[PDB]
PDB file of C-alpha atoms in Angstrom:
ATOM      1  CA  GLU A   1     153.560  70.585  15.456  1.00  0.00           C
ATOM      2  CA  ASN A   2     156.133  72.933  13.945  1.00  0.00           C
ATOM      3  CA  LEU A   3     159.108  72.879  16.267  1.00  0.00           C
ATOM      4  CA  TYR A   4     162.366  74.791  16.317  1.00  0.00           C
ATOM      5  CA  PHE A   5     165.262  74.255  18.714  1.00  0.00           C
ATOM      6  CA  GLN A   6     168.402  76.252  19.368  1.00  0.00           C
ATOM      7  CA  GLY A   7     170.286  74.352  22.032  1.00  0.00           C
ATOM      8  CA  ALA A   8     168.488  74.697  25.337  1.00  0.00           C
ATOM      9  CA  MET A   9     165.910  76.982  23.748  1.00  0.00           C
ATOM     10  CA  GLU A  10     162.676  75.915  22.097  1.00  0.00           C
ATOM     11  CA  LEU A  11     160.911  78.462  19.921  1.00  0.00           C
ATOM     12  CA  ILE A  12     157.260  78.796  20.928  1.00  0.00           C
ATOM     13  CA  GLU A  13     156.195  81.919  18.975  1.00  0.00           C
ATOM     14  CA  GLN A  14     157.636  84.145  16.314  1.00  0.00           C
ATOM     15  CA  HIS A  15     155.953  87.180  14.821  1.00  0.00           C
ATOM     16  CA  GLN A  16     157.298  90.010  12.675  1.00  0.00           C
ATOM     17  CA  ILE A  17     156.527  93.444  14.095  1.00  0.00           C
ATOM     18  CA  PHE A  18     157.934  96.853  13.152  1.00  0.00           C
ATOM     19  CA  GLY A  19     160.505  95.174  10.968  1.00  0.00           C
ATOM     20  CA  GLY A  20     161.904  93.015  13.762  1.00  0.00           C
ATOM     21  CA  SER A  21     161.046  89.669  15.303  1.00  0.00           C
ATOM     22  CA  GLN A  22     159.009  89.155  18.469  1.00  0.00           C
ATOM     23  CA  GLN A  23     159.888  85.718  19.775  1.00  0.00           C
ATOM     24  CA  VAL A  24     158.871  83.607  22.736  1.00  0.00           C
ATOM     25  CA  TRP A  25     161.169  80.784  23.778  1.00  0.00           C
ATOM     26  CA  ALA A  26     161.061  78.061  26.382  1.00  0.00           C
ATOM     27  CA  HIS A  27     163.950  76.562  28.324  1.00  0.00           C
ATOM     28  CA  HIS A  28     164.766  74.598  31.396  1.00  0.00           C
ATOM     29  CA  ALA A  29     165.664  76.985  34.174  1.00  0.00           C
ATOM     30  CA  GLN A  30     168.205  75.268  36.423  1.00  0.00           C
ATOM     31  CA  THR A  31     167.838  77.949  39.113  1.00  0.00           C
ATOM     32  CA  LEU A  32     164.051  77.462  39.277  1.00  0.00           C
ATOM     33  CA  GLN A  33     163.879  73.702  38.612  1.00  0.00           C
ATOM     34  CA  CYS A  34     161.145  74.250  36.036  1.00  0.00           C
ATOM     35  CA  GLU A  35     160.500  75.098  32.406  1.00  0.00           C
ATOM     36  CA  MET A  36     160.272  78.809  31.691  1.00  0.00           C
ATOM     37  CA  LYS A  37     159.101  80.972  28.847  1.00  0.00           C
ATOM     38  CA  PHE A  38     160.591  84.332  27.967  1.00  0.00           C
ATOM     39  CA  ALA A  39     160.044  86.834  25.197  1.00  0.00           C
ATOM     40  CA  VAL A  40     162.736  88.486  23.131  1.00  0.00           C
ATOM     41  CA  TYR A  41     162.351  91.198  20.520  1.00  0.00           C
ATOM     42  CA  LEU A  42     165.102  91.440  17.931  1.00  0.00           C
ATOM     43  CA  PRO A  43     165.258  94.583  15.841  1.00  0.00           C
ATOM     44  CA  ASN A  44     166.065  94.138  12.196  1.00  0.00           C
ATOM     45  CA  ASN A  45     169.769  93.312  12.125  1.00  0.00           C
ATOM     46  CA  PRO A  46     170.854  91.344   9.048  1.00  0.00           C
ATOM     47  CA  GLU A  47     174.530  91.918   9.908  1.00  0.00           C
ATOM     48  CA  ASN A  48     174.221  90.676  13.499  1.00  0.00           C
ATOM     49  CA  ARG A  49     175.591  93.917  14.913  1.00  0.00           C
ATOM     50  CA  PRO A  50     175.886  93.716  18.731  1.00  0.00           C
ATOM     51  CA  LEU A  51     173.000  95.496  20.447  1.00  0.00           C
ATOM     52  CA  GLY A  52     172.288  96.406  24.028  1.00  0.00           C
ATOM     53  CA  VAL A  53     169.622  94.584  25.980  1.00  0.00           C
ATOM     54  CA  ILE A  54     166.816  95.943  28.126  1.00  0.00           C
ATOM     55  CA  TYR A  55     165.140  93.494  30.546  1.00  0.00           C
ATOM     56  CA  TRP A  56     161.490  94.305  31.266  1.00  0.00           C
ATOM     57  CA  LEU A  57     160.100  92.757  34.433  1.00  0.00           C
ATOM     58  CA  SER A  58     156.351  92.340  34.687  1.00  0.00           C
ATOM     59  CA  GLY A  59     154.044  92.623  37.672  1.00  0.00           C
ATOM     60  CA  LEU A  60     151.567  90.529  39.587  1.00  0.00           C
ATOM     61  CA  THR A  61     149.270  88.225  37.574  1.00  0.00           C
ATOM     62  CA  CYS A  62     151.284  88.731  34.376  1.00  0.00           C
ATOM     63  CA  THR A  63     153.130  86.295  32.169  1.00  0.00           C
ATOM     64  CA  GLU A  64     155.557  87.278  29.415  1.00  0.00           C
ATOM     65  CA  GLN A  65     152.515  87.983  27.230  1.00  0.00           C
ATOM     66  CA  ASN A  66     151.123  91.121  28.804  1.00  0.00           C
ATOM     67  CA  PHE A  67     154.026  93.440  27.969  1.00  0.00           C
ATOM     68  CA  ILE A  68     154.727  92.084  24.500  1.00  0.00           C
ATOM     69  CA  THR A  69     151.096  92.319  23.410  1.00  0.00           C
ATOM     70  CA  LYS A  70     149.874  95.444  25.232  1.00  0.00           C
ATOM     71  CA  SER A  71     152.751  97.850  25.720  1.00  0.00           C
ATOM     72  CA  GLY A  72     153.315  98.822  22.119  1.00  0.00           C
ATOM     73  CA  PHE A  73     157.043  98.826  22.863  1.00  0.00           C
ATOM     74  CA  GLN A  74     158.331  97.198  19.673  1.00  0.00           C
ATOM     75  CA  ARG A  75     157.941 100.364  17.621  1.00  0.00           C
ATOM     76  CA  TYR A  76     160.450 102.055  19.933  1.00  0.00           C
ATOM     77  CA  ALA A  77     162.809  99.125  20.302  1.00  0.00           C
ATOM     78  CA  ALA A  78     162.997  99.139  16.522  1.00  0.00           C
ATOM     79  CA  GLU A  79     163.601 102.892  16.420  1.00  0.00           C
ATOM     80  CA  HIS A  80     166.396 102.626  18.964  1.00  0.00           C
ATOM     81  CA  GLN A  81     167.771  99.293  17.813  1.00  0.00           C
ATOM     82  CA  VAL A  82     167.732  97.619  21.186  1.00  0.00           C
ATOM     83  CA  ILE A  83     166.921  94.063  22.141  1.00  0.00           C
ATOM     84  CA  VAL A  84     164.200  93.731  24.731  1.00  0.00           C
ATOM     85  CA  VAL A  85     163.777  90.631  26.898  1.00  0.00           C
ATOM     86  CA  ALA A  86     160.539  90.095  28.835  1.00  0.00           C
ATOM     87  CA  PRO A  87     160.844  87.195  31.283  1.00  0.00           C
ATOM     88  CA  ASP A  88     158.020  85.503  33.112  1.00  0.00           C
ATOM     89  CA  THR A  89     157.137  86.492  36.675  1.00  0.00           C
ATOM     90  CA  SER A  90     157.424  83.202  38.603  1.00  0.00           C
ATOM     91  CA  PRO A  91     158.311  79.573  38.196  1.00  0.00           C
ATOM     92  CA  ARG A  92     155.575  77.552  36.496  1.00  0.00           C
ATOM     93  CA  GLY A  93     154.350  74.003  36.436  1.00  0.00           C
ATOM     94  CA  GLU A  94     152.022  71.611  38.210  1.00  0.00           C
ATOM     95  CA  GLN A  95     155.011  70.633  40.373  1.00  0.00           C
ATOM     96  CA  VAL A  96     155.507  74.278  41.424  1.00  0.00           C
ATOM     97  CA  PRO A  97     153.610  75.451  44.517  1.00  0.00           C
ATOM     98  CA  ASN A  98     150.849  77.976  44.004  1.00  0.00           C
ATOM     99  CA  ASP A  99     148.292  79.995  45.947  1.00  0.00           C
ATOM    100  CA  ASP A 100     144.949  81.144  44.619  1.00  0.00           C
ATOM    101  CA  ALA A 101     145.524  84.732  45.778  1.00  0.00           C
ATOM    102  CA  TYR A 102     146.711  87.030  43.010  1.00  0.00           C
ATOM    103  CA  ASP A 103     149.470  88.378  45.265  1.00  0.00           C
ATOM    104  CA  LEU A 104     151.143  85.060  46.162  1.00  0.00           C
ATOM    105  CA  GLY A 105     152.422  82.026  44.258  1.00  0.00           C
ATOM    106  CA  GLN A 106     152.474  81.790  40.502  1.00  0.00           C
ATOM    107  CA  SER A 107     152.697  85.101  38.649  1.00  0.00           C
ATOM    108  CA  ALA A 108     153.870  86.511  42.000  1.00  0.00           C
ATOM    109  CA  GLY A 109     157.519  85.586  42.451  1.00  0.00           C
ATOM    110  CA  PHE A 110     158.596  89.028  43.804  1.00  0.00           C
ATOM    111  CA  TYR A 111     162.029  88.720  42.187  1.00  0.00           C
ATOM    112  CA  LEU A 112     163.588  87.245  45.329  1.00  0.00           C
ATOM    113  CA  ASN A 113     165.285  84.009  46.405  1.00  0.00           C
ATOM    114  CA  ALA A 114     162.838  82.220  48.674  1.00  0.00           C
ATOM    115  CA  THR A 115     164.074  80.338  51.716  1.00  0.00           C
ATOM    116  CA  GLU A 116     160.879  78.894  53.188  1.00  0.00           C
ATOM    117  CA  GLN A 117     159.347  75.611  52.137  1.00  0.00           C
ATOM    118  CA  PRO A 118     157.679  74.831  49.946  1.00  0.00           C
ATOM    119  CA  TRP A 119     158.682  77.946  48.017  1.00  0.00           C
ATOM    120  CA  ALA A 120     162.403  77.509  48.247  1.00  0.00           C
ATOM    121  CA  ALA A 121     162.498  74.710  45.709  1.00  0.00           C
ATOM    122  CA  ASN A 122     161.440  76.838  42.757  1.00  0.00           C
ATOM    123  CA  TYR A 123     161.030  80.502  43.758  1.00  0.00           C
ATOM    124  CA  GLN A 124     164.501  81.738  42.934  1.00  0.00           C
ATOM    125  CA  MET A 125     163.503  84.494  40.530  1.00  0.00           C
ATOM    126  CA  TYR A 126     166.249  86.866  41.707  1.00  0.00           C
ATOM    127  CA  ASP A 127     168.973  84.339  40.769  1.00  0.00           C
ATOM    128  CA  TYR A 128     167.167  83.483  37.507  1.00  0.00           C
ATOM    129  CA  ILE A 129     166.871  87.090  36.347  1.00  0.00           C
ATOM    130  CA  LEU A 130     170.320  88.210  37.522  1.00  0.00           C
ATOM    131  CA  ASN A 131     172.402  85.238  36.409  1.00  0.00           C
ATOM    132  CA  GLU A 132     170.801  82.416  34.486  1.00  0.00           C
ATOM    133  CA  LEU A 133     168.603  84.121  31.928  1.00  0.00           C
ATOM    134  CA  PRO A 134     171.147  86.776  30.875  1.00  0.00           C
ATOM    135  CA  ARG A 135     173.709  84.034  30.296  1.00  0.00           C
ATOM    136  CA  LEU A 136     171.306  82.326  27.884  1.00  0.00           C
ATOM    137  CA  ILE A 137     170.394  85.593  26.154  1.00  0.00           C
ATOM    138  CA  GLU A 138     174.044  86.476  25.622  1.00  0.00           C
ATOM    139  CA  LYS A 139     174.823  83.001  24.261  1.00  0.00           C
ATOM    140  CA  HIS A 140     172.152  83.037  21.580  1.00  0.00           C
ATOM    141  CA  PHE A 141     171.403  86.643  20.622  1.00  0.00           C
ATOM    142  CA  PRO A 142     173.610  89.395  19.211  1.00  0.00           C
ATOM    143  CA  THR A 143     174.309  91.451  22.310  1.00  0.00           C
ATOM    144  CA  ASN A 144     177.028  93.962  23.094  1.00  0.00           C
ATOM    145  CA  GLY A 145     177.490  92.787  26.645  1.00  0.00           C
ATOM    146  CA  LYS A 146     175.561  95.692  28.141  1.00  0.00           C
ATOM    147  CA  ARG A 147     172.150  95.577  29.766  1.00  0.00           C
ATOM    148  CA  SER A 148     169.623  97.779  31.524  1.00  0.00           C
ATOM    149  CA  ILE A 149     166.517  96.886  33.468  1.00  0.00           C
ATOM    150  CA  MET A 150     163.019  98.221  34.042  1.00  0.00           C
ATOM    151  CA  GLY A 151     159.574  96.997  34.967  1.00  0.00           C
ATOM    152  CA  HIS A 152     156.072  97.605  36.253  1.00  0.00           C
ATOM    153  CA  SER A 153     154.786  97.270  39.840  1.00  0.00           C
ATOM    154  CA  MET A 154     156.252  94.028  41.319  1.00  0.00           C
ATOM    155  CA  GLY A 155     158.525  94.243  38.267  1.00  0.00           C
ATOM    156  CA  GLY A 156     159.544  97.797  39.084  1.00  0.00           C
ATOM    157  CA  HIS A 157     160.380  96.578  42.562  1.00  0.00           C
ATOM    158  CA  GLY A 158     162.452  93.833  40.926  1.00  0.00           C
ATOM    159  CA  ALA A 159     164.240  96.165  38.555  1.00  0.00           C
ATOM    160  CA  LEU A 160     165.237  98.616  41.263  1.00  0.00           C
ATOM    161  CA  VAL A 161     166.309  95.924  43.719  1.00  0.00           C
ATOM    162  CA  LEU A 162     168.455  94.230  41.063  1.00  0.00           C
ATOM    163  CA  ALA A 163     169.994  97.493  39.914  1.00  0.00           C
ATOM    164  CA  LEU A 164     170.758  98.702  43.446  1.00  0.00           C
ATOM    165  CA  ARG A 165     172.275  95.435  44.540  1.00  0.00           C
ATOM    166  CA  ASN A 166     174.303  94.748  41.438  1.00  0.00           C
ATOM    167  CA  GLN A 167     175.751  98.085  40.500  1.00  0.00           C
ATOM    168  CA  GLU A 168     177.941  97.686  37.415  1.00  0.00           C
ATOM    169  CA  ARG A 169     175.711  94.894  36.146  1.00  0.00           C
ATOM    170  CA  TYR A 170     173.119  97.384  34.834  1.00  0.00           C
ATOM    171  CA  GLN A 171     173.742 100.550  32.862  1.00  0.00           C
ATOM    172  CA  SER A 172     170.417 102.147  33.807  1.00  0.00           C
ATOM    173  CA  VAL A 173     167.144 101.423  35.586  1.00  0.00           C
ATOM    174  CA  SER A 174     163.595 102.734  35.406  1.00  0.00           C
ATOM    175  CA  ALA A 175     160.120 101.728  36.535  1.00  0.00           C
ATOM    176  CA  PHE A 176     156.415 102.165  36.095  1.00  0.00           C
ATOM    177  CA  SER A 177     154.226 102.158  39.194  1.00  0.00           C
ATOM    178  CA  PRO A 178     156.879 100.387  41.324  1.00  0.00           C
ATOM    179  CA  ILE A 179     156.347  98.846  44.724  1.00  0.00           C
ATOM    180  CA  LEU A 180     159.083 100.870  46.377  1.00  0.00           C
ATOM    181  CA  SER A 181     158.841  99.900  50.071  1.00  0.00           C
ATOM    182  CA  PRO A 182     157.479  96.358  49.928  1.00  0.00           C
ATOM    183  CA  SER A 183     158.325  95.660  53.596  1.00  0.00           C
ATOM    184  CA  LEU A 184     155.846  98.342  54.601  1.00  0.00           C
ATOM    185  CA  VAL A 185     152.827  97.532  52.428  1.00  0.00           C
ATOM    186  CA  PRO A 186     150.524  94.500  52.290  1.00  0.00           C
ATOM    187  CA  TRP A 187     151.751  92.984  49.039  1.00  0.00           C
ATOM    188  CA  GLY A 188     155.298  92.817  50.289  1.00  0.00           C
ATOM    189  CA  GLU A 189     154.446  91.915  53.865  1.00  0.00           C
ATOM    190  CA  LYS A 190     152.445  88.906  52.766  1.00  0.00           C
ATOM    191  CA  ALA A 191     154.819  87.622  50.110  1.00  0.00           C
ATOM    192  CA  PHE A 192     157.983  88.159  52.140  1.00  0.00           C
ATOM    193  CA  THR A 193     156.402  86.486  55.146  1.00  0.00           C
ATOM    194  CA  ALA A 194     155.579  83.462  53.023  1.00  0.00           C
ATOM    195  CA  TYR A 195     158.753  83.295  50.977  1.00  0.00           C
ATOM    196  CA  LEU A 196     161.338  84.586  53.492  1.00  0.00           C
ATOM    197  CA  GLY A 197     159.736  84.090  56.906  1.00  0.00           C
ATOM    198  CA  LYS A 198     158.754  86.384  59.747  1.00  0.00           C
ATOM    199  CA  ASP A 199     162.202  87.853  60.344  1.00  0.00           C
ATOM    200  CA  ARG A 200     161.801  91.207  58.641  1.00  0.00           C
ATOM    201  CA  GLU A 201     165.528  91.756  58.666  1.00  0.00           C
ATOM    202  CA  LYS A 202     165.740  89.180  55.876  1.00  0.00           C
ATOM    203  CA  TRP A 203     163.408  91.310  53.777  1.00  0.00           C
ATOM    204  CA  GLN A 204     165.687  94.304  53.631  1.00  0.00           C
ATOM    205  CA  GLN A 205     167.838  92.964  50.812  1.00  0.00           C
ATOM    206  CA  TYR A 206     164.741  92.864  48.559  1.00  0.00           C
ATOM    207  CA  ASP A 207     163.343  96.300  49.353  1.00  0.00           C
ATOM    208  CA  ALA A 208     164.428  99.286  47.242  1.00  0.00           C
ATOM    209  CA  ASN A 209     163.576 101.797  49.953  1.00  0.00           C
ATOM    210  CA  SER A 210     165.577  99.843  52.508  1.00  0.00           C
ATOM    211  CA  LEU A 211     168.528  99.334  50.159  1.00  0.00           C
ATOM    212  CA  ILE A 212     168.812 103.066  49.620  1.00  0.00           C
ATOM    213  CA  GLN A 213     168.665 103.585  53.403  1.00  0.00           C
ATOM    214  CA  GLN A 214     171.507 101.051  53.709  1.00  0.00           C
ATOM    215  CA  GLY A 215     173.682 103.051  51.341  1.00  0.00           C
ATOM    216  CA  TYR A 216     173.164 101.333  47.983  1.00  0.00           C
ATOM    217  CA  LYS A 217     173.001 103.771  45.069  1.00  0.00           C
ATOM    218  CA  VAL A 218     172.486 103.924  41.330  1.00  0.00           C
ATOM    219  CA  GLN A 219     173.739 106.738  39.101  1.00  0.00           C
ATOM    220  CA  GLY A 220     170.126 107.624  38.395  1.00  0.00           C
ATOM    221  CA  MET A 221     166.621 106.259  37.946  1.00  0.00           C
ATOM    222  CA  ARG A 222     163.403 107.241  36.271  1.00  0.00           C
ATOM    223  CA  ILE A 223     160.045 106.421  37.815  1.00  0.00           C
ATOM    224  CA  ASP A 224     156.623 107.117  36.266  1.00  0.00           C
ATOM    225  CA  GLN A 225     153.532 106.898  38.406  1.00  0.00           C
ATOM    226  CA  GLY A 226     149.885 107.455  37.445  1.00  0.00           C
ATOM    227  CA  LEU A 227     147.796 109.517  39.854  1.00  0.00           C
ATOM    228  CA  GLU A 228     144.581 107.546  39.236  1.00  0.00           C
ATOM    229  CA  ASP A 229     146.375 104.339  40.155  1.00  0.00           C
ATOM    230  CA  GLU A 230     144.223 102.602  42.776  1.00  0.00           C
ATOM    231  CA  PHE A 231     147.315 101.081  44.420  1.00  0.00           C
ATOM    232  CA  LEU A 232     149.215 104.330  44.893  1.00  0.00           C
ATOM    233  CA  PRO A 233     148.049 105.035  48.451  1.00  0.00           C
ATOM    234  CA  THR A 234     148.044 101.383  49.560  1.00  0.00           C
ATOM    235  CA  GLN A 235     150.989  99.586  47.912  1.00  0.00           C
ATOM    236  CA  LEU A 236     153.231 102.029  46.068  1.00  0.00           C
ATOM    237  CA  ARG A 237     153.581 105.155  48.246  1.00  0.00           C
ATOM    238  CA  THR A 238     156.026 106.847  45.940  1.00  0.00           C
ATOM    239  CA  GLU A 239     156.282 109.952  48.131  1.00  0.00           C
ATOM    240  CA  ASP A 240     157.822 107.965  50.989  1.00  0.00           C
ATOM    241  CA  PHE A 241     160.486 106.631  48.609  1.00  0.00           C
ATOM    242  CA  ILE A 242     161.280 110.111  47.381  1.00  0.00           C
ATOM    243  CA  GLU A 243     161.972 111.160  50.973  1.00  0.00           C
ATOM    244  CA  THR A 244     164.335 108.214  51.413  1.00  0.00           C
ATOM    245  CA  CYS A 245     166.201 109.115  48.243  1.00  0.00           C
ATOM    246  CA  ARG A 246     166.521 112.731  49.283  1.00  0.00           C
ATOM    247  CA  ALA A 247     167.890 111.795  52.682  1.00  0.00           C
ATOM    248  CA  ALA A 248     170.400 109.453  51.035  1.00  0.00           C
ATOM    249  CA  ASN A 249     171.369 111.900  48.279  1.00  0.00           C
ATOM    250  CA  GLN A 250     170.244 109.333  45.710  1.00  0.00           C
ATOM    251  CA  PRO A 251     169.185 111.285  42.583  1.00  0.00           C
ATOM    252  CA  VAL A 252     165.718 110.443  41.338  1.00  0.00           C
ATOM    253  CA  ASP A 253     163.612 111.480  38.356  1.00  0.00           C
ATOM    254  CA  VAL A 254     159.994 110.861  39.298  1.00  0.00           C
ATOM    255  CA  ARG A 255     157.019 111.805  37.174  1.00  0.00           C
ATOM    256  CA  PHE A 256     153.432 111.856  38.380  1.00  0.00           C
ATOM    257  CA  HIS A 257     150.850 111.692  35.620  1.00  0.00           C
ATOM    258  CA  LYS A 258     147.387 113.124  36.150  1.00  0.00           C
ATOM    259  CA  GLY A 259     144.570 110.907  34.938  1.00  0.00           C
ATOM    260  CA  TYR A 260     146.667 107.784  34.323  1.00  0.00           C
ATOM    261  CA  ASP A 261     146.086 104.498  36.133  1.00  0.00           C
ATOM    262  CA  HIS A 262     148.033 101.269  36.869  1.00  0.00           C
ATOM    263  CA  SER A 263     147.235  99.588  33.553  1.00  0.00           C
ATOM    264  CA  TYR A 264     149.076  98.870  30.339  1.00  0.00           C
ATOM    265  CA  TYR A 265     147.211 101.856  28.902  1.00  0.00           C
ATOM    266  CA  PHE A 266     149.440 103.982  31.125  1.00  0.00           C
ATOM    267  CA  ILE A 267     152.561 101.952  30.377  1.00  0.00           C
ATOM    268  CA  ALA A 268     151.963 102.181  26.614  1.00  0.00           C
ATOM    269  CA  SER A 269     151.730 105.938  26.918  1.00  0.00           C
ATOM    270  CA  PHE A 270     155.307 106.366  28.142  1.00  0.00           C
ATOM    271  CA  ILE A 271     157.167 103.148  27.323  1.00  0.00           C
ATOM    272  CA  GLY A 272     158.793 104.853  24.345  1.00  0.00           C
ATOM    273  CA  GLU A 273     160.364 107.407  26.639  1.00  0.00           C
ATOM    274  CA  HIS A 274     161.789 104.592  28.754  1.00  0.00           C
ATOM    275  CA  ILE A 275     163.165 102.757  25.738  1.00  0.00           C
ATOM    276  CA  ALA A 276     164.858 105.979  24.642  1.00  0.00           C
ATOM    277  CA  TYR A 277     166.179 106.558  28.167  1.00  0.00           C
ATOM    278  CA  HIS A 278     167.893 103.196  28.342  1.00  0.00           C
ATOM    279  CA  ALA A 279     169.048 103.149  24.752  1.00  0.00           C
ATOM    280  CA  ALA A 280     171.361 106.079  25.429  1.00  0.00           C
ATOM    281  CA  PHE A 281     173.182 104.025  28.055  1.00  0.00           C
ATOM    282  CA  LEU A 282     173.442 100.947  25.864  1.00  0.00           C
ATOM    283  CA  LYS A 283     175.387 102.080  22.831  1.00  0.00           C
TER     284      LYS A 283
END
């Protein structure tokens, strides 16, 4: 039982990798009324120079572990000297409601603020990611006050929604395999119905496609999508989002990759390009 505490944070894991430190910490999340774990990678930085932060949001069924173990990202975060934070994907705990389906409940928070019981008590992932967690990160780690955001699938949805809604908060945004029009596909119809209710007007503030239709813009975005991704035709429908962006005059860099699927094997293949993309905005 080797413990380490830094204020509200408890250190759960620490591992050296590519010269830096991959950490996992736990803390009490006031916004979620539960204990949460998050990962942070700190590039070698003996002088505590302020560094920019990239938040990586993970998708359905993931914890903080999937990205930090499978993406291979640390090599690139070290190269670019950027801090990378990988939060969890839902509240957690035996006191937190769940559903056995992979697309609802734990590991399926959809980066929104739920209003319907019993989800409202803990499912405030939008507030947690936007406000609470960054405040903790900035308190304890050597940051330069700038941040960018990216993610995969439900996490790409989250990244784009957060960037569109919060403007100056994020220097840049990108995504792998994002759910771009969640109101219009089964994953988002089901989760929204449960978490936000049957009034689809309430869904629009958590739907990147809709937000762009409403007039929200970002300076740019990069999206990478595999063409052998089984969810492309059913949940992701990137082409529809492109049409929305074009109609809105929202610039978009979108890359379709032959032969690549939805997995971390795809993410690993281009995560370095995303780290480089954001790093340029975080100096």
